[PDB]
């Protein structure tokens, strides 16, 4: 499910944010902007509580997940909090096993081919290219050859100027979270609306 949902919505937002209240008030601004995919990164305090309290957006059409989930306990809290897909910055075999057994979509972070191949051998063909700011669209374009069945989600370093540049290389959905979360909820929504339309058109 989550795979085609990503390929359809073509953007996911990670919330580099402060306290639960501001995280909640900022996860609405992006939703009204059209970014229906939202990740509550555990760097915010009590992201489990944020997801539990904000599950009301599920009915409206938001897709809430957990980002920067480093540990299996954090994966627990994310699943029992109602998040429908866990995201990690690195590759974690035990987290990927728990996600596999609980049917929770998981896209770990792989920067280099020797991590990408391990990810493939664990069964994930949708991967988080972290950090995009370091690798570039060149990594995706050059790795499209040897591994054409792996499709990337470049989180970090994606902004207005080059988002469809990353899209012209074969990614599903950028993972922008500081050029679409840094501001007040009246301009966060404005950036989301001007950022989910350039993705659509370019």
43 is in an annotated binding site: no
Task: Please name the residue that has the structure tokens 């896209």.
Answer: 107
In whole angstroms, give the CA distance from residue 177 to residue 71: 21
Residues 6 or more apart in contact with residue 51 via CB below 8 angstroms: 40, 64, 66, 78, 81, 82, 83
**What are the two backbone dihedrals, phi and then psi, of residue 66, each rounded to the nearest 5 degrees?**
-115, 130
Of residues 10, 77, 128, 191, which has the active-site annotation?
A: 128
68 is in an annotated binding site: yes
Experimental method: cryo-EM
β-strands 151-152, 85-87 pairing: unpaired
User: Residue 107's beta-bridge partner residues?
Assistant: 87
CATH node for 2-200? 3.20.20.70
Nearest CA-CA partner of 26 in 62, 2, 59: 62
How many Å separate Cα 151 from the centre of its chain? 13
* Contact of 86 with 95, CB cutoff 8 Å: yes
* Contact of 149 with 125, CB cutoff 8 Å: yes
Q: What's the burial of 93, exposed, middle or buried (CB within 10 Å: 0-12/13-18/19+)? A: exposed
* Contact of 34 with 65, CB cutoff 8 Å: no
16 is in an annotated binding site: yes
Nearest CA-CA partner of 4 in 126, 121, 86, 120: 126
Of residues 39, 77, 84, 191, which has the active-site annotation?
A: 39
Q: Which two tokens stand for residue 61?
A: 């059409």
Does 3 participate in catalysis according to the annotation?
Answer: no
In whole angstroms, give the CA distance from residue 47 to residue 5: 22
Residues 6 or more apart in contact with residue 149 via CB below 8 angstroms: 125
* Contact of 78 with 54, CB cutoff 8 Å: no
Task: Please name the residue that has the structure tokens 């509580």.
Answer: 49
Does 133 participate in catalysis according to the annotation?
Answer: no
In whole angstroms, give the CA distance from residue 167 to residue 187: 24
How many Å separate Cα 186 from the centre of its chain? 22
* Contact of 105 with 85, CB cutoff 8 Å: yes
């Amino acid at each position: 499910k989550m795979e085609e949902l990503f390929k359809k919505h073509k953007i996911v937002a990670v919330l580099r944010a402060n306290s639960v209240e501001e995280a909640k008030k900022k996860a609405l601004a992006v939703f009204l902007g059209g970014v229906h995919l939202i990740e509550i990164t555990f760097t915010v305090p009590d992201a489990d509580t944020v997801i539990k309290e904000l599950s009301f957006l599920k009915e409206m059409g938001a897709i809430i997940g957990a980002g920067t989930v480093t540990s299996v306990e954090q994966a627990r809290k994310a699943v029992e909090s109602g998040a429908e897909f866990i995201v990690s910055p690195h590759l974690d075999e035990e987290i990927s096993q728990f996600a596999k057994e609980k049917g929770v979509f998981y896209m770990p972070g792989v920067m280099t081919p020797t991590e990408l191949v391990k990810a493939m051998k664990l069964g994930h063909t949708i991967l988080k290219l972290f950090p995009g700011e370091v690798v570039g669209p060149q990594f995706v374009k050059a790795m499209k050859g040897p591994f054409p069945n792996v499709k990337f989600v470049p989180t970090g370093g994606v902004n207005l100027d080059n988002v469809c540049e990353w899209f012209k290389a074969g990614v599903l959905a950028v993972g922008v979270g500081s050029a679409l979360v840094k501001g007040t909820p009246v301009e966060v929504a404005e950036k989301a609306k001007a950022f989910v339309e350039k993705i659509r058109g370019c």
